[PDB]
Each structure stands twice: as structure tokens, then as C-alpha cells.
Amino acid sequence: MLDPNLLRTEPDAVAEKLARRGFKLDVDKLRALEERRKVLQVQTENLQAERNSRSKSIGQAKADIEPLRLEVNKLGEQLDAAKSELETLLAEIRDIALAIPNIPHDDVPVGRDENDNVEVSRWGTPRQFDFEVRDHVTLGEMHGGLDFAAAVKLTGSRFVVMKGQLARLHRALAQFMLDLHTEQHGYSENYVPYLVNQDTLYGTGQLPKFAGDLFHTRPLEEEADSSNYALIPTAEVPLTNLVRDEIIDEDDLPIKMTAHTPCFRSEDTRGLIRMHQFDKVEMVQIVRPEDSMAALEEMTGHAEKVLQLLGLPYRKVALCTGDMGFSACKTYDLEVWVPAQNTYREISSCSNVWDFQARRMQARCRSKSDKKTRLVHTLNGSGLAVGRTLVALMENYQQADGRIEIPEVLRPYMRGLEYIG
Amino acid sequence: MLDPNLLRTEPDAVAEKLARRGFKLDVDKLRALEERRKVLQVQTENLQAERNSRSKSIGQAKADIEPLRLEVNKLGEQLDAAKSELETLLAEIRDIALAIPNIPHDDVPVGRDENDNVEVSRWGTPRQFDFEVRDHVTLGEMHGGLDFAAAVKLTGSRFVVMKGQLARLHRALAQFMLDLHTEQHGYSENYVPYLVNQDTLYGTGQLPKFAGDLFHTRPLEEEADSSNYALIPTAEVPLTNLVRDEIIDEDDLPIKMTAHTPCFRSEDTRGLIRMHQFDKVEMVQIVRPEDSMAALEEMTGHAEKVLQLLGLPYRKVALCTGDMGFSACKTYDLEVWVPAQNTYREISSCSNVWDFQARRMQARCRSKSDKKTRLVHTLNGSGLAVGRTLVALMENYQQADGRIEIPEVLRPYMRGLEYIG
Ligand SMILES: Nc1cc(CO)cc2ncn([C@@H]3O[C@H](COS(=O)(=O)NC(=O)[C@@H](N)CO)[C@@H](O)[C@H]3O)c12
Ligand SMILES: Nc1cc(CO)cc2ncn([C@@H]3O[C@H](COS(=O)(=O)NC(=O)[C@@H](N)CO)[C@@H](O)[C@H]3O)c12
Ligand SMILES: [Ca+2]
Ligand SMILES: [Ca+2]
Ligand SMILES: [Ca+2]
Ligand SMILES: [Ca+2]
Ligand SMILES: [Ca+2]
Ligand SMILES: [Ca+2]
Numbered sequence: 022m023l024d025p026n027l028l029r030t031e032p033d034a035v036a037e038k039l040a041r042r043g044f045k046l047d048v049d050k051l052r053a054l055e056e057r058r059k060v061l062q063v064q065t066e067n068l069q070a071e072r073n074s075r076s077k078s079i080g081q082a083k084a085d086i087e088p089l090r091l092e093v094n095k096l097g098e099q100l101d102a103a104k105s106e107l108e109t110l111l112a113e114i115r116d117i118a119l120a121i122p123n124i125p126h127d128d129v130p131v132g133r134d135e136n137d138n139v140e141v142s143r144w145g146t147p148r149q150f151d152f153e154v155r156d157h158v159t160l161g162e163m164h165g166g167l168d169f170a171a172a173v174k175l176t177g178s179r180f181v182v183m184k185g186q187l188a189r190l191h192r193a194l195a196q197f198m199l200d201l202h203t204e205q206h207g208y209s210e211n212y213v214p215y216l217v218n219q220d221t222l223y224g225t226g227q228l229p230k231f232a233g234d235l236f237h238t239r240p241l242e243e244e245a246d247s248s249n250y251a252l253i254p255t256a257e258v259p260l261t262n263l264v265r266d267e268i269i270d271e272d273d274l275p276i277k278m279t280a281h282t283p284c285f286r287s288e289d290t291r292g293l294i295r296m297h298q299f300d301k302v303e304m305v306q307i308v309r310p311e312d313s314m315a316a317l318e319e320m321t322g323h324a325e326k327v328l329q330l331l332g333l334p335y336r337k338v339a340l341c342t343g344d345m346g347f348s349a350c351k352t353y354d355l356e357v358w359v360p361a362q363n364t365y366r367e368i369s370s371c372s373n374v375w376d377f378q379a380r381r382m383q384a385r386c387r388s389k390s391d392k393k394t395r396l397v398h399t400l401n402g403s404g405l406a407v408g409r410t411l412v413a414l415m416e417n418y419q420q421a422d423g424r425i426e427i428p429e430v431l432r433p434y435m436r437g438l439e440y441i442g
Numbered sequence: 443m444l445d446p447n448l449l450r451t452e453p454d455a456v457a458e459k460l461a462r463r464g465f466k467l468d469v470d471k472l473r474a475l476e477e478r479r480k481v482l483q484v485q486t487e488n489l490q491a492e493r494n495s496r497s498k499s500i501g502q503a504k505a506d507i508e509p510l511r512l513e514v515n516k517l518g519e520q521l522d523a524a525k526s527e528l529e530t531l532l533a534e535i536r537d538i539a540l541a542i543p544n545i546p547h548d549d550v551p552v553g554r555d556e557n558d559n560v561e562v563s564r565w566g567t568p569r570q571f572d573f574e575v576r577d578h579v580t581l582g583e584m585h586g587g588l589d590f591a592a593a594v595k596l597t598g599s600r601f602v603v604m605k606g607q608l609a610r611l612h613r614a615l616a617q618f619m620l621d622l623h624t625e626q627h628g629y630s631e632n633y634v635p636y637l638v639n640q641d642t643l644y645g646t647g648q649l650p651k652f653a654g655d656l657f658h659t660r661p662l663e664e665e666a667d668s669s670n671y672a673l674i675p676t677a678e679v680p681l682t683n684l685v686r687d688e689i690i691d692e693d694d695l696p697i698k699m700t701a702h703t704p705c706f707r708s709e710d711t712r713g714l715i716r717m718h719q720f721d722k723v724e725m726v727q728i729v730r731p732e733d734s735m736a737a738l739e740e741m742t743g744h745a746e747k748v749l750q751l752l753g754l755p756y757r758k759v760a761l762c763t764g765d766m767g768f769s770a771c772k773t774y775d776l777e778v779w780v781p782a783q784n785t786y787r788e789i790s791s792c793s794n795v796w797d798f799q800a801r802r803m804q805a806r807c808r809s810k811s812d813k814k815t816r817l818v819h820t821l822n823g824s825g826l827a828v829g830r831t832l833v834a835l836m837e838n839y840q841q842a843d844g845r846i847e848i849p850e851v852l853r854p855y856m857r858g859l860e861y862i863g
Contacts, residue, residue: 171684172635174641174642174683174686174687175634175635175638175639175642175680175683175684176635176637176638176639176642176671176680177639177665177668177669177671178665180635180637181633181635182632182633182634182635182680182684183632183633184630184631184632185630185631186631188631188632188633189624189631191633192620192631192633192702196617199613203610204857209605209606210605210606210607210609210610210613211603211604211605211609212602212603212604212609212612212613213596213603214593214596214597214601214602214603214719215636215704215719216597216601216657216706216718216719217596217597218596218597218598220595221595221596221597233663236637236659236660236662236671237659237660238657238658238659238660238673239657239658239659239660241657241708242654242708243708244598244599244708247598248598248708250597250598250657252659252673259596259597259603262595262596263592263596263603265595266595281613283636283704285637287662287663287664287665287669297637298635298636298637436625
């Protein structure tokens with residue numbers, strides 16, 4: 022959600038920044054709705070006041086209360102009708118306001134799509150192979166460890182069954198990532214629900230605009246009016262909502278949280294690349310408004326550190342205005358080298374959300390003296406998407422016979438094992 | 443599913459065994475449906491034969507084919523009508539057959555409910571405390587590590603948010619359990635889908651009878667006719683279905699599999715005890731029919747070994763006929779000591795399923811020479827339910843000030859940490 026006072030004072034200036042994302046803000050409709058809202062708001066508050074006054078006259082006349090009671094009931098019917106008409110108009114304003122993406126920060130390069138993204142840095146040298154590179158699907162078949170056919174039998178397309186040592190390696194990657202962020206990077210570990218409610222989804226921006234990208238669960242028989250849930254598309258959703266409706270003491274900031282969860286989306290026909298269910302170790306930071314740009318560089322470095330310790334070459338890319346996600350104001354993507362595809366592929370997206378989710382959640386901070394609160398800033402970043410790390414690990418460390426060399430940093434997580442196979 | 447030939451030859455003998463569970467088999471309705479099925483089956487196969495013959499006469503007359511074509515279309519309409527009437531009757535037989543629980547093995551003590559279960563063994567001595575025992579909810583509040591209120595905000599009742607060292611300890615328990623079963627007990631690790639289809643749910647017995655105990659997801663826009671999924675209530679569902687429609691070489695048996703998954707059910711108002719989402723390390727065995735009773739003792743010992751290495755006192759209980767789950771033919775429950783409740787509480791259920799799920803899945807085995815296949819037997823057991831292990835660990839190892847002593851066997855999983863707090 023953008024600042025409603027910013028939409029009322031500078032609508033054309035806001036529409037200009039949003040045009041860089043390719044978003045056309047309907048300024049004309051927002052103005053006509055807002056002018057009609059002020060007319061209905063005055064009419065409604067006048068009815069609220071006269072009804073309140075007419076009912077006080079009843080208690081004052083108790084010292085015939087029937088002619089006064091009829092008037093109070095007509096005023097009550099008129100007030101409810103005016104309140105419903107007003108609420109219908111407020112919901113139309115909300116339908117527009119809650120579908121507006123975040124305003125891009127000035128640091129973001131202007132661009133129309135992913136071909137306009139700017140490479141910021143590169144690390145490591147892609148391996149030169151002495152044989153024909155096999156992809157992760159072929160490697161998983163050779164080991165009997167990645168089985169897409171069994172997952173189609175159990176469920177359907179875009180799911181996987183991992184078996185044996187490759188399932189073990191996938192678990193080891195998550196253990197290493199969680200240990201790195203909690204032991205070296207200052208994040209606190211969290212176990213979160215994988216089903217969340219509508220308030221949580223509105224809070225992080227998935228609702229109202231991206232309902233179709235979620236798996237929704239039908240309400241339960243015994244919780245019929247309070248169980249309209251959806252599976253989490255990322256741990257960013259439950260983690261960021263932990264500060265919803267909170268006033269945090271600024272001394273307690275930053276709040277740095279991590280979690281390893283499955284992620285569920287219904288948004289590459291072959292492999293672990295774009296599945297409906299995938300594991301991801303997520304990093305979330307809740308910070309003071311002035312520290313969010315520095316916290317973005319810090320969190321991006323925490324994700325880069327995972328790729329560096331694993332020996333996986335990668336590139337850091339600043340997303341342009343046209344390639345950013347809905348709630349981000351600034352994003353860096355990390356793209357890992359994938360030898361069978363001869364290119365870098367996205368493995369992490371690190372964003373500064375500014376106060377866009379804090380506005381929806383009412384997440385604020387305050388100094389003990391300060392007579393006023395302030396919205397916090399929120400940030401989220403993959404550190405990393407675990408299945409994509411397994412793809413990169415398998416392809417970059419494959420041997421001529423298909424054996425997988427286990428990166429040195431993961432060997433304590435595999436009981437010192439050097440190779441799978 | 444029970445053997446259909448056993449329901450046709452010994453219906454009263456089957457009804458007698460099922461009566462021990464408190465299940466009344468409607469023998470009279472099954473017989474009347476089966477007699478009417480034989481009438482419709484003869485009438486249908488006679489129509490299939492005459493239609494097949496009448497269409498062959500068309501090709502033979504190509505050497506006027508209009509009087510013969512009209513007859514073929516009337517026969518075709520009569521055959522389709524007879525096939526639909528027959529299929530409606532087959533579905534009524536299926537509605538009865540697929541709701542019948544498994545026949546209890548003779549080893550199972552006869553009983554009406556859980557108060558008739560038989561204690562088989564006991565291990566360890568419940569700790570005598572020098573202070574008033576705190577429950578896991580109070581301990582989690584003192585540490586700030588178990589937060590039920592935050593989970594109600596994110597989702598609703600019967601969910602939890604774990605934070606900091608207690609989330610870390612919960613992860614350490616799962617790591618230890620998976621490492622024990624894969625390193626010492628011969629199980630192969632699996633990563634499975636957490637959403638499964640209707641065939642999978644019918645295969646393990648959740649459908650048709652227990653649909654109301656599952657979270658169901660609405661079909662996806664782009665997969666409208668192939669995405670009616672449900673969240674897994676246990677890893678037994680995807681793991682056991684890995685052998686659906688397979689003929690396994692008997693030399694490859696036993697197939698021993700383990701997985702750590704969240705579990706989702708909508709079946710203790712306070713705590714981690716009965717939540718809609720809980721983690722569990724599951725053990726599944728697919729074995730030859732003659733080895734299933736020995737494999738049950740082996741798998742129960744693998745679950746008991748977890749409690750023993752963790753130093754948690756427990757009791758092993760043989761469930762009576764009236765307290766067994768739907769698909770089990772024989773079950774042992776392990777009940778861990780819970781000091782705040784002054785009793786043992788269920789933490790594992792280990793079952794021999796016999797051929798009941800193998801019948802539904804068509805999972806069979808064969809020796810290379812053997813001219814005929816045989817249904818395998820399946821088994822499943824908790825090793826263990828992770829949140830209940832955390833409950834027992836917290837309460838049994840709490841110190842007077844609320845600190846949690848980390849069991850010796852988990853300390854390598856916590857970087858040598860001795861106490862939380
Ligand atoms: N996003 C993606 C989509 C799909 C479609 O179901 C399959 C994937 N399997 C792996 N990912 C990986 O998930 C990462 C994070 O996703 S993101 O939407 O860009 N960003 C977030 O969710 C933020 N909370 C920061 O992590 C991406 O960088 C991608 O590599 C997939
Ligand atoms: N079952 C249970 C139900 C609920 C209600 O949502 C919450 C729970 N939180 C922990 N469990 C634990 O899950 C264990 C296994 O569940 S079972 O249905 O008995 N058996 C199976 O699922 C087999 N596949 C063997 O594991 C039980 O022993 C119980 O301690 C819960
Ligand atoms: Ca501080
Ligand atoms: Ca974001
Ligand atoms: Ca992106
Ligand atoms: Ca063998
Ligand atoms: Ca069972
Ligand atoms: Ca039970």
C-alpha cells in the first residue's frame with residue numbers, strides 16, 4: 022500500500038514513478054472516487070451525530086418516548102443505508118489502492134523488461150569440462166535420485182521425488198544455509214506455519230492482486246468461517262507478518278529472521294527449476310527507515326556468501342523498473358552458473374520493500390522518548406532457493422562418470438563423504 | 443481393500459473378525475448387490491458380443507450397409523445403457539468395500555476402546571523433580587521460543603511459531619532421527635511432495651472414508667481437471683504409494699524408506715500436542731508377505747531406539763481391536779513420559795498393514811522363476827512425531843530456572859551446546 026496522503030497531494034508525481042514500471046495509475050478515477058467520498062463522508066457523519074443526539078433525547082425524556090423512538094429508528098435506517106453506500110465506495114478505492122505496485126527507488130535503473138537489467142558484479146570462473154556436460158535431470162536418473170515420474174504418479178506435473186544420497190544432499194544444503202545465517206549472519210531461526218490466512222496474505226502484498234498464483238485450501242467443517250487459508254509461496258509471508266500490528270522499540274531493531282520452508286506456487290518444462298513445491302532458506306529483516314539501503318547490501322552479501330563457500334560461480338544483477346516484483350522498491354538477483362544451459366540462472370532475489378508492507382501490516386517503531394511512531398522498513402532475500410542450489414551443485418561438480426563431488430563446505434554435513442557414487 | 447474372493451467365500455467369517463473392531467459388515471446388502479451384479483454382467487457381456495459380431499458383419503457386407511448400420515447403432519445404445527446401469531451398481535459395491543477397515547491379526551487383543559489396550563513393555567524411570575513441573579507451553583513462554591499467539595495472527599488456532607534456540611532444537615531432533623534411521627537402521631532418505639492426488643489417497647486408505655480429516659486444495663486455473671489435491675496427513679501416504687502399480691523383484695525387498703515432512707490434519711486445547719500442522723520423521727517398509735510380522739518388531743525397535751538415545755522414559759502398548767486405525771492389522775503405540783500431565787502420551791504408532799494397501803495400489807512382488815506374482819505387505823511407523831518429542835524433551839530436561847538441558851546425543855547437532863538459556 023502506498024501512502025494515501027501521497028496519492029492525494031502528488032498523484033501525477035506518483036503516476037510518473039509508477040509509469041517507469043509499466044504501470045498506468047488511473048489518477049482520474051481515483052480523484053472522482055475521492056471527491057464523491059468526501060460528499061458521502063460529510064452526509065454520513067452528520068447522520069451519526071443527529072442519531073446520537075436523538076437517542077440522548079430519549080434518556081432525557083424518561084424523566085412519552087414513542088414519537089421520539091420512531092424518529093430514532095428512521096434515522097437509524099437512513100444512517101445504515103448511508104454507511105453501506107459509503108462502504109461500497111471505500112471498497113472501490115481499496116480495489117484500486119491495493120493493486121498499485123511499490124514506487125521504485127531512484128537507485129533502480131529505468132527499463133522495460135529483464136533484458137534491461139544491469140549486471141553489478143561477477144564472482145568465480147565457470148568450469149571448463151573435458152566431456153559433454155550432463156544436465157541435473159540426466160544426473161539424477163543416473164543416480165536414481167531425482168524421480169519426476171514417481172511425483173507425477175503421486176501428485177502431478179511440476180513435483181519431484183528425491184531418493185537416497187541426492188535427498189540427503191538437498192537436506193545438507195538447507196542445514197548449511199540455516200547454520201550460516203544463524204551462526205555468522207545474526208539471523209534468528211523460526212519454525213512457521215505453511216498455511217496462512219487472508220490478513221497475512223494482504224499484509225505482504227499477495228492479496229488482492231495475486232490470488233491466482235496460490236494454492237488455496239477449502240475451509241474446514243469445524244472451522245467453517247475462520248479457515249480460508251492458502252499455502253505459503255515463500256517464508257517471507259509468515260516471517261514479515263510477525264511484526265503486524267506491533268510497535269517495536271527502535272533499540273530492538275534490526276529484527277533479523279530466517280526459516281527453511283517448502284514454498285507453494287501455481288504461477289522450463291524439464292527439472293527442479295520451476296516446480297509447484299520447492300524448499301527455500303529465507304532471510305527477512307525489519308529495520309528503521311534510515312537503515313534499509315545498507316541492510317539490502319548486507320542481506321545480498323549474506324546470500325552471495327552461500328554461493329562463495331559452495332564454490333558456485335554467479336553474477337549479481339540490479340533489476341530494472343520493469344522487471345521488479347510487486348512490493349519491492351529495489352531488488353538484486355543472484356544468478357548462478359548452470360553448465361548444461363551455458364548461462365546464469367536466478368537462484369536468489371533480495372529486496373528492499375521500504376514501508377509498503379509495513380503500511381498494510383501497521384508495523385511501526387518508536388524511540389522511548391519520541392511522541393510519534395514511524396513505519397518500519399522490511400526486506401526479504403533468498404539465501405538460497407534449495408532445489409536450484411542442488412541443480413547448480415550437481416551440474417558444476419559432476420564427474421565424467423556422473424559422480425557428484427560434494428563441495429568441501431558441505432562434507433561435515435555428509436559425514437565427511439567426498440563423492441556421491 | 444479386503445480380498446474380494448474372501449468376501450464372496452467367507453462373508454460371515456470376515457464379518458466376525460470385523461465385529462471385534464466394532465464394525466458391522468452389511469453382509470446382506472453385499473450379497474444382494476453381488477447377485478444383481480452377476481445378472482447385469484451376463485446381460486452386458488452378451489450385448490458386447492452381439493455388437494462386436496454385428497459390426498464385423500458390416501465389414502463382411504462391404505464386398506447395402508444401411509439396414510445393418512441402424513441395428514449396430516441400436517445395439518450400441520442398448521450396450522451403453524446396460525454398461526451405465528452396471529457401472530452404477532459397481533460403484534455402490536465399491537462404496538461399501540472401500541469403507542471396510544482391515545481385518546485384525548489374531549495377535550491383537552480383543553477390546554472395545556483405548557482402555558482395553560495392553561502394555562507390552564516399559565523403559566526408563568520418570569524423573570523426580572525438586573520444584574513444581576512447568577509444562578512445555580510455560581517453558582516456551584519463558585524462553586520466548588513457542589508463540590501460539592503469533593500463529594493465531596498468521597493463520598488460526600492449532601498452529602505454532604517457534605523462535606530462536608527452541609526452533610533450532612526442533613530442527614536438531616529431525617536431523618538426529620533421519621541420521622539414525624538412514625545410518626544405523628537401513629532406511630533410504632526421501633524428499634516427497636506434500637500435496638498428493640486422489641489415487642494416492644485411495645491407495646493408502648484416506649479415501650473414501652476420511653476425506654473430512656484432510657486439507658483439500660482448490661484446483662488450479664491452468665490444471666483445472668488434474669489438480670484436485672490434498673495436503674499429506676503423514677509421509678506414509680506418498681512413501682507407500684511409491685510402489686503403486688509395480689512388480690518388485692523379491693530380491694529387492696525389503697524396501698525401507700524414511701522422510702521428514704510437515705503433516706496436515708483437520709481431525710488438547712493447549713500446546714504442540716494436537717496441531718493442524720506438525721513435523722514427523724516417518725519409516726515405511728515394503729516387504730514379502732512372510733516377513734511382515736518380524737519387520738513390525740524391527741521397525742518398533744527403531745522408534746524405541748530414538749526415545750532410548752534421547753533418555754526419554756516410555757511405555758510400549760499393543761492396541762486392542764477397538765483402538766486400531768483403519769488400515770492396520772496390528773499396531774504398537776509408544777507413549778513417552780510427560781511430567782506436567784503425570785502420564786505417558788502417544789509419540790509413535792507402528793503398524794503392519796498386511797496386504798490392505800498393496801491391494802488398493804496393485805503393489806506386487808515376484809521371484810524371477812515364479813509363474814505368479816503376490817501382493818507385498820506394507821508397514822509404517824513414526825520415528826518420531828517431532829513436536830511431541832520436543833514437548834517430552836522440554837518437560838523432562840527442564841531446570842529449576844526454566845533452562846532446557848540438551849540431551850547428550852543432540853549436543854553434536856547443537857554445536858556442543860549443553861543448555862538452552
Ligand atoms: N521463484 C520461484 C518460482 C517458482 C514457480 O513455482 C519455482 C521456483 N523454484 C525456485 N524458485 C526460486 O525462488 C527464489 C525466490 O523467489 S522470488 O519470488 O523471486 N522472491 C521471494 O520469494 C522473496 N521472498 C525472496 O526469496 C527465486 O530467485 C527462484 O530462483 C522459484
Ligand atoms: N497423529 C496426530 C494427530 C494430530 C491431529 O492433527 C496431531 C499430531 N501431532 C503429533 N501427532 C503424532 O503423530 C503420530 C503418528 O500419527 S498416526 O496417525 O498415529 N500414525 C501415522 O500417521 C502413521 N503414518 C505412522 O506414523 C501419533 O503417534 C501422534 O503422536 C499427531
Ligand atoms: Ca538492541
Ligand atoms: Ca518483496
Ligand atoms: Ca525476480
Ligand atoms: Ca537384495
Ligand atoms: Ca496404517
Ligand atoms: Ca493410534
